[PDB]
Swiss-Prot record:
Belongs to the ATG8 family. This is Microtubule-associated protein 1 light chain 3 beta. Keywords: Autophagy, Cytoplasm, Cytoplasmic vesicle, Cytoskeleton, Lipoprotein, Membrane, Microtubule, Mitochondrion, Phosphoprotein, Ubl conjugation, Ubl conjugation pathway. It comes from Homo sapiens. Changing H30Y: Increased interaction with WDFY3/ALFY, no effect on SQSTM1-binding. The precursor molecule is cleaved by ATG4 (ATG4A, ATG4B, ATG4C or ATG4D) to expose the glycine at the C-terminus and form the cytosolic form, LC3-I. The processed form is then activated by APG7L/ATG7, transferred to ATG3 and conjugated to phosphatidylethanolamine (PE) phospholipid to form the membrane-bound form, LC3-II. During non-canonical autophagy, the processed form is conjugated to phosphatidylserine (PS) phospholipid. ATG4 proteins also mediate the delipidation of PE-conjugated forms.
Length: 122
């Protein structure tokens, strides 16, 4: 309903140069954490909104483990599908540590962005 404001993403809330500086601080202060932004896909109509956007993920966590963590945060039932996408592809089969996903996939601003949805392509 146009009665309500549109959902704004992390990159709309914080400028590139702000995000850059935020990641510079995290990398110095928490060197073994990966800085991850997790957001619901803009067109998603089944899954609820996440109660946190910016996560400091220990670098040894793998994607199977991260999927369980976000399904838990969202309080999903086993009947609900959930897909976690990085740059247009699904993370379920990655299983390398998130340290390697960061190195391959991180944004120019230094955060690793993920989008979740009830389907794999969208």
């Amino acid at each position: 309903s146009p009665e309500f404001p549109s959902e704004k993403t992390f990159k709309q809330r914080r400028t590139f140069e702000q995000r850059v500086e935020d990641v510079r601080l995290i990398r110095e202060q928490h060197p073994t954490k990966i800085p991850v932004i997790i957001e619901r896909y803009k067109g998603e109509k089944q899954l609820p909104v996440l109660d946190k956007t910016k996560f400091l993920v220990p670098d040894h966590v793998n994607m199977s483990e991260l999927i369980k963590i976000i399904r838990r945060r969202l309080q999903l039932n086993a009947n609900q599908a959930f897909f976690l996408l990085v740059n247009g592809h699904s993370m379920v089969s990655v299983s390398t540590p998130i340290s390697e996903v960061y190195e391959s996939e991180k944004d120019e601003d230094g955060f690793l962005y993920m989008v979740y949805a009830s389907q794999e392509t969208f």
